[PDB]
Design a protein around this ligand. Structure first.
Ligand SMILES: CC(=O)N[C@H]1[C@@H](OP(=O)(O)O)O[C@H](CO)[C@@H](O)[C@@H]1O
Ligand SMILES: CC(=O)N[C@H]1[C@@H](OP(=O)(O)O)O[C@H](CO)[C@@H](O)[C@@H]1O
Ligand SMILES: CC(=O)N[C@H]1[C@@H](OP(=O)(O)O)O[C@H](CO)[C@@H](O)[C@@H]1O
Ligand SMILES: CC(=O)N[C@H]1[C@@H](OP(=O)(O)O)O[C@H](CO)[C@@H](O)[C@@H]1O
Ligand SMILES: CC(=O)N[C@H]1[C@@H](OP(=O)(O)O)O[C@H](CO)[C@@H](O)[C@@H]1O
Ligand SMILES: CC(=O)N[C@H]1[C@@H](OP(=O)(O)O)O[C@H](CO)[C@@H](O)[C@@H]1O
Ligand SMILES: [Co+2]
Ligand SMILES: [Mg+2]
Ligand SMILES: [Mg+2]
Ligand SMILES: [Mg+2]
Ligand SMILES: [Mg+2]
Lengths: 452, 452, 452
């Protein structure tokens, strides 16, 4: 059997945040969600998330995530901030006393930890018949991490916390990832022998290593060369360095699968985003949420799309949009705002300084300049003049030509093939094939300027 | 004599692209074009580009490039994907049998290879009286490249392909750039001795090295320290890493020549772009095509310009434009769209939420807010009110003041010094110095709001 | 006693600029200003800035800076470009002959030099009882810097200029930072023994080291590990590398204090900018000048703000603004332009394609689409229809609803709770609770399209 505990109990005081550390997000999931998704793929028999401060704020999101992953996720509360050693103990109490499996310990602030790393850890753990196996790695800057101590003979002695290391030890660049596999009897038995005489006056989980080494138990360290996989987040400088490392990888994966990305460093792609072959993404682009881009698209510089669906061969340039759909071969931008519920048919055009909200717009229809469309349904191959406003429901037919400077005052229906004169205010329905007008006739006042 | 072959025959399957590898672009030229420009500057007597898959799609662009560089470029077809060794052979068939020159082999996926490197290679080749000279370099990640094998005595033994190296050899970090100079008799004679018993069942050009070493011929390797100069492109992650390296260099060259670039990493400058002394470029700027910027300009953040000409001391801020000209001391932006054929005279202004298309706009005239100008010619020192539309030809005189919310319905002529009232629709000509109006008079309905 | 000289006398010819090197800016101060601020914090008894070329252009800004820092800053002119050795001499002439203090020499092209480094230098200088102490550092590329020469015994021999080093010496990677502390009698006495037989035919300050070593005086070098602290600026590639290093640090300091910064590399924050806890900054953001952001704000991608004040919990997305204030919980963007003098009350909204200039806008009022507001005061909880223009003073009351396509022709007053019909031109005052209209009635011309 195997059980995974997720240590999400700490305060994250160095985040300086009213929002709990473990719910800050990157690439579209919270850290906690990234950690849980990864574990879920490995499918251990039990899964326990230990919470402490802010638990009423984190618990409901653990339950939300248990439904999305379709499995039970238990929650063990930690009453006293008595250390991580104490947190494992709290977590074990959600396990039956008779429990015979392996226990794997993990935190929830390690968002790039993946299912293979855990697998390699369990496999290695079982292969060497070890009481405790710990993931290590080595870093340029090892600040804030337990250091790994070994004999002459390379044997793992102990783990010394940052607050507790001599200056001489603070130099050690092998670090404790804080990801372990334990034999359960050995874990139970060393947790009892933890004392809190140390710099933080806590029960260090990391003391368990020296303890089992004392009983002449087998202690294994498994070095992870790709340090990003087990990097943790304590503050916002680390949050962003890893949001950025994860972004590099998402982008590179899209590039190898056929997407041209002009500039990876300023192209942000959330984990659920799909993009078709031979589309080009220009720089300053964020593809967020469940956004889908077809193939042979152009996604223009300085574009932001959240939960937008874009068909094949469409261009979406300098566009700020969400919760909207854009058809094949359609043209959006530059300087275009899509609010929730915009659907633009195939071959359609929303141009410069156009805003659409909750509007359905038919195949091949063009709204190219300076106009607001909201709460409107517009038919096919229609053309909406510059400088207009759908004054919010309105329905507009197919093959319509509305003139510049038309205000459609909802609710109003414009019939197939109708026209509107420049500067018309439409307050009553327009029959198919009629010209609606309201502008007064021009009058020239000669020599007005000499006089005034 | 000297002949250059360009090996552009392969499939680029790892690009995952319906567009042939060698025609993907960076900084304004396709890879093929970058390679050919560089060779062209060296001016060898013959120049042969070997094509294979997609040759009907690549051939016409080779001919297009031969005219631009004003020299003959021959095309040798490779009938069977039988290897690069085979590709050199196909390429040699476009040479006369009596041919006595040096042959230099190059690919066309090496876009930063420059005329000096080739020169250094030919010079070195002749200096050491060598049968074969190959360019090498050393890399952090040597994946996918032939490895260079040497004796104890540092003598070049052979080149081993990635697919063919032992794990022990895959560690070697000296790589084959795939750029060579051959003595022709030696090249002909080792091409005949190539066999295809290897991992790809192809005729490896790289086997030619071991072969000439066998006949006790002179084999020279010339190490290139600047690895970017001979880096090749197999996939889109490599395309962008080098588009980015080339961009660093273009930008740095502009910085040393007097252009302030706030942020090189997000400033994209195509190779043909010229920029004057003491202009400042702010971040998120792309200067593409034959775009020219004068001096003491400000080019604002988040600006995209393609084949735009900008005079001296003009500002072009948050502007998306192409195929357009902007005069000295003019002001464009923020949030401004220039379509093809926009000319804005000196001291002119196109402001926020303005779109211009095919329009000529005179010295010192201002279009500052919320307006569409297309197919129009506007004179000098005129002022176009906010929220207007040139409803496309229209001509507007000099010293005009058109009021807000005016629709000029083409075709219409507005005389010098004329005015337009706020919300006028202009359908007939306006005499110089006349006030054109059409808006109805205001009426106040008192206490309407209590009633409704 | 202690006196600081700032060597700002050189020509900066490699800047290629009509603007003096030392006045090019980064993060909101000129280099000179950064250097002077840092020294000012240390508060030496005397402070002398030596000027040479362009001194009439730099002097008035030295005086401006003396008032801001509230202390006397003297200016010593250098008549002849006779070297840096000569420049120290010119600088000493502003000191009394009897002067007994330490002299510290600094340039003004070293913008990240900080008050601690100077302090460490003075302290070290006094601690070792040294005649001359020089700051050194070591670099990947030491080009253009004096090299540090030492015996077998690690004792500082001399400093050799770039123009003067053997190729063998050009390899030395310990460099002279050009920041020193001198015992004054020793400085006076070695300046007299400087001769100009060297590559630039100048009086090298750096020769002073070999000279004092000759008199068997104590020569100390103090190595600075953080090389950015003493990096100098000769050209625009170096200007931007350090503008970028300083930006990393400003941003990281905000991140550790509680600001989420999605992308540091494209987030530019000037030194005076303050940002509250738990605000998020998205990429492509510049926060320039005395800009202040409250807490829990969202500052949207692609935003530029200069001397903007933003309250708490407001969003400012895709906005280009300056000299303006935005209240708590207000919404600005996307695609919004704020000119000088915009004040938007708490809970207010300026939306897509809106431009405001010199306008005051009351609590909870919304200007959401396609409109120009300038020279206007608008009351509370009002709503301004899309596609409108304040045709500039206008006053608008509270709880107003103005319809789409309204032109307010200043000067005009709109009473509390008044309405305006769609497409109204307002030329006369509107009583509280009145409906102002001017649009003509709609007319449908049936079958117009068949006929035309
Ligand atoms: C359990 C413990 O006492 N210390 C751990 C632990 O420190 P924290 O301050 O709790 O983050 O996490 C580190 C791994 O992220 C690890 O290096 C260290 O050994
Ligand atoms: C009449 C109109 O064109 N737009 C209205 C309309 O825009 P929405 O996109 O529907 O939010 O409703 C808003 C009322 O919440 C109002 O601020 C705005 O003026
Ligand atoms: C001709 C050949 O057989 N192999 C060459 C060749 O491999 P390709 O898979 O054909 O790209 O190009 C490399 C240089 O880009 C070089 O390293 C290698 O030795
Ligand atoms: C009348 C007008 O102002 N603009 C027209 C006009 O803009 P262009 O910039 O010329 O493409 O022609 C288009 C017809 O292809 C049409 O979509 C748009 O409505
Ligand atoms: C005073 C002198 O003769 N040379 C100095 C000096 O060279 P400049 O060319 O004047 O920048 O500044 C360098 C420090 O930025 C230092 O390395 C060098 O030793
Ligand atoms: C009438 C109007 O709406 N806007 C005017 C008005 O804008 P300002 O934001 O005030 O610069 O004054 C300008 C005169 O300098 C003029 O170019 C523009 O047309
Ligand atoms: Co109107
Ligand atoms: Mg941690
Ligand atoms: Mg290749
Ligand atoms: Mg209008
Ligand atoms: Mg210098």
């Amino acid at each position: 059997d195997t059980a995974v505990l997720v240590l999400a109990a700490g305060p994250g005081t160095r985040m300086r945040s009213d929002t709990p550390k473990v719910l800050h997000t990157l690439a579209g999931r919270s850290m906690l969600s990234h950690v849980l998704h990864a574990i879920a793929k490995l499918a251990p028999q039990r899964l326990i998330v230990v919470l402490g401060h802010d638990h009423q704020r984190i618990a409901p999101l653990v339950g939300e995530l248990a439904d999305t992953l379709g499995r039970t996720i238990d929650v063990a509360l930690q009453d006293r901030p008595l250390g991580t050693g104490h947190a494992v103990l709290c977590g074990l109490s959600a396990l039956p006393d008779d429990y015979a499996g392996n226990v794997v310990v993990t935190s929830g602030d390690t968002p790039l930890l993946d299912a293979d790393t855990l697998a390699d850890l369990i496999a290695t753990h079982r292969a060497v018949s070890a009481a405790v196996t710990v993931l290590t790695t080595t870093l340029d800057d090892p600040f804030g991490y337990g250091r790994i101590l070994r004999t002459q003979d390379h044997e793992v002695m102990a783990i010394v916390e940052q607050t507790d290391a001599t200056p001489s030890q603070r130099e050690i660049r092998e670090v404790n990832a804080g990801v372990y596999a334990f034999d359960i009897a050995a874990l139970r038995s060393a947790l009892s022998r933890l004392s809190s005489n140390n710099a933080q006056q806590e029960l260090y989980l990391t003391d368990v290593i020296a303890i089992l080494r004392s009983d002449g138990q087998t202690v294994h360290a498994s070095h992870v060369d790709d340090s990003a996989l087990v990097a943790g987040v304590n503050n916002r400088v680390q949050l962003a360095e890893l949001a950025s490392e994860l972004n590099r990888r998402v982008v590179a994966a899209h590039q190898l699968a056929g997407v041209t990305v002009v500039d990876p460093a300023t192209t942000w792609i959330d984990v659920d985003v799909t993009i078709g072959r031979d589309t080009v993404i220009h720089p300053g682009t964020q593809l967020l949420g469940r956004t889908q881009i077809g193939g042979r698209c152009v996604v223009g510089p300085d574009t932001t799309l959240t939960d937008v669906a874009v068909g094949d061969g469409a261009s979406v340039v300098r566009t700020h949009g969400s919760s909207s759909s854009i058809g094949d071969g359609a043209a959006v931008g530059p300087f275009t705002y899509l609010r929730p519920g915009t659907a633009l048919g195939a071959d359609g055009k929303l141009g410069a300084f156009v805003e659409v909200k909750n509007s359905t717009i038919g195949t091949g229809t063009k709204v190219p300049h300076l106009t607001y469309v909201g709460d409107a349904d517009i038919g096919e191959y229609s053309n909406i003049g510059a400088s207009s406003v759908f004054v919010n429901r309105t329905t507009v037919g197919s093959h319509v030509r509305t003139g510049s400077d038309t205000m459609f005052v909802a609710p109003v229906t414009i019939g197939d093939g109708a026209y509107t004169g420049a500067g018309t205010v439409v307050r009553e329905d327009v029959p198919p094939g009629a010209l609606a007008v309201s502008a007064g006739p021009q009058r020239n006042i000669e020599n007005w300027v000499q006089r005034k």
